[PDB]
Point group: none
């Protein structure tokens, strides 16, 4: 027996390396043999669990101009050294 589940703000699916989030989903429920089955329908988004500190443009531009590094590498290097310019430079 399928039943509608009202007022669901969000479903989150958690894995080791990431989470999947469905906002304001449509959700149905069923109970069978001791387990519940939930059908969740909506648009999903993927949350990679790594977070990165922000880096100022001037610092990125400086490192690029001084080392010949790409924007990608300069940015990464500065994240890798906690925003320390001298060490980002040294590392490139």
């Amino acid at each position: 027996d399928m039943k509608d589940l009202r007022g669901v703000e969000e479903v989150v699916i958690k894995l080791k390396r990431k989470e999947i989030i469905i906002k304001n989903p449509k959700v149905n429920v069923m109970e069978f043999m001791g387990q519940k089955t939930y059908q969740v329908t909506g648009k999903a988004r993927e949350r990679s669990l790594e977070a990165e500190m922000e880096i100022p443009e001037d610092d990125i531009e400086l490192v690029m101009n001084q080392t010949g590094a790409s924007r990608e590498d300069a940015t990464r290097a500065l994240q890798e050294t906690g925003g320390d310019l001298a060490e980002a430079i040294m590392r490139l």
Copy 2:
């Protein structure tokens, strides 16, 4: 047209008043007409969510003395109505 989704540690279903948590569920996925549908099977547990707020002592007292309610119920009533005294009284 279902695919298996491997390594799911937890699914949480979030509503205003509570969340439903399924540990180490089995999860299937399909996409149809722009929406994902996830089927999630496992044993479910519930976790309730309560209004987080400051309740004036004098309001708790007033509700208790006017309805004969315990401190516990008066406090929960006022939480339920967002500190509205008239409604807290009416519900008890």
Copy 3:
């Protein structure tokens, strides 16, 4: 310099034993001396991190009637034994 932060769906404050969730908050930001300060305003709710399995009324009522336990104790006992009636009974 205070700046408004638009489109914030939710702020979650995490502690060891619980989380505080503010839905669709108003949020302002300021940067000073390397740290950002966020002012978050809205109605909060408290998520206690313990989740409980559901228990059928018939089982609660049975245990109550057979042991003389209160609804609170019968419910707790059945959660404590994973819904096993014979052991809930034995425990009361």
Copy 4:
């Protein structure tokens, strides 16, 4: 009229496209006219959120060949527009 909030392990600020995470922040709280205001200070990091969906190969190919975009950008463009090809093309 601020109180200290002790033992906060993390604050997460959630938006559609990203989340801002502050580890071991300092947090103050006050209540005024029915709303809580939280002040949260600490070093912030960003975590981006991406549309989770199936993108047809032939659509990726079409966008690449029509705009000269890399597989990477075409795929991200189509993610950005929810699989709408016209708009994916226009944005690249």
